[PDB]
Amino acid sequence: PQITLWKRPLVTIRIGGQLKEALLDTGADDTVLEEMNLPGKWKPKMIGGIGGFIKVRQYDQIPIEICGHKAIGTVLVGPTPVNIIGRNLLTQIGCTLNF
Amino acid sequence: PQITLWKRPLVTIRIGGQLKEALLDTGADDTVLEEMNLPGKWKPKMIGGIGGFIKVRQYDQIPIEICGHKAIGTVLVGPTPVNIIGRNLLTQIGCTLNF
Ligand SMILES: O=C(N[C@@H](Cc1ccccc1)[C@H](O)CN(CC1CCCCC1)S(=O)(=O)c1ccc2ncsc2c1)c1cccc(O)c1
């Protein structure tokens, strides 16, 4: 598909039994999801942006479905105000910027 | 051009005869540049990111050439970690997400 940028590029993603709306975000190195109690091992991390840093939990090899495309990779979980699909997954679903 | 996402989508911009590197950031509503001098009136504004809110200076109708494409729009100046091109100017240069 082609997604214009008049509005926020929000799309439906699925992670287990949760469907969520998430930004397709070319500015995000990593994928950051709102607080959720995912199973398995994780490692603490701090990530920075406008305003400063937040503390997140890094989960590896988590399958995520983004607009029906399959991805699997690292997901950071913490008190972000918006679900963010970062470049680590955007590349996997074939996402480019075009102008 | 078509820009893939295995690397950060950094591009050269021209603003006030100065060249700068900026990130094409679909997750950003606004264009936000690191501290710099720009001519004219500005308005104080506050914006929010992943780590909270910051104070910026809002400049309107500022020309920027992004990777050869002309925009004229709102540019916020403040303590962003990195120069970012947001949706307000991404739309002006005809940028879309594709997969
Ligand atoms: O900060 C914004 N946008 C955010 C997304 C956003 C939207 C709305 C609310 C909060 C955040 C960015 O697109 C992604 N961030 C990465 C940062 C951006 C700042 C400087 C460079 C790198 S980010 O969110 O801070 C971010 C994301 C992934 C990641 N992985 C490793 S470090 C890291 C940082 C934003 C949103 C709306 C208006 C606005 O003026 C700015």
Strands of chain A, total number: 9
Number of helices of chain A: 1
Structural class of chain A: mainly beta
Tell me the distance between the termini of chain A. 15 Å
CATH superfamily of chain A: Acid Proteases
Strand content of chain A: over 45%
Largest interface by residue count? Answer: A-B, 40 and 39 residues
Name every ligand kind in the structure: ligand F72
CATH topology of chain A: Cathepsin D, subunit A, domain 1
What percent of the residues of chain A sit in helical stretches (DSSP H or I)? under 10%
Protein name (chains A, B): Protease
InterPro entries (chains A, B): Aspartic_peptidase_AS, Peptidase_A2_cat, Peptidase_aspartic_dom_sf, Retropepsin-like_cat_dom, Retropepsins
Domain Peptidase A2 (chains A, B): 20-89
Organism (chains A, B): Human immunodeficiency virus type 1 (HIV-1)
Summarize the structure.
With 99 residues, chain A is mainly beta.
Describe the structure.
It is classed as hydrolase/hydrolase inhibitor. Keywords: HIV-1 protease, drug resistance, drug design, protease inhibitors, aids, aspartyl protease, HYDROLASE-HYDROLASE INHIBITOR complex. It forms a dimeric assembly. Two copies of one chain form a homodimer. With 99 residues, chain A is mostly beta strands. Chain A has one domain (1-99): Beta Barrel (Cathepsin D, subunit A, domain 1). Helix content of chain A is 4%, strand content 55%. Chain A has one helix and nine strands, in the order ββββββββαβ. In chain A, strands 2, 3, 4, 5, 6, 7 and 8 form a seven-stranded mixed sheet that branches. In chain A, a hairpin with a 2-residue loop joins β2 (10-15) and β3. The longest helix of chain A is centred in the C-terminal third of the chain and has 4 residues, at 87-90. Chain A starts with a strand and ends with a strand. In chain A, 36% of the residues are buried. Chains A and B meet through β1, β5, β6 and β9 of A and β1, β5, β6 and β9 of B. The complex binds ligand F72. The ligand O=C(N[C@@H](Cc1ccccc1)[C@H](O)CN(CC1CCCCC1)S(=O)(=O)c1ccc2ncsc2c1)c1cccc(O)c1 sits between chains B (23, 25, 27-30, 32, 47, 49-50, 80-82, 84, 86) and A (25, 27-30, 32, 47-50, 81-82, 84, 86).
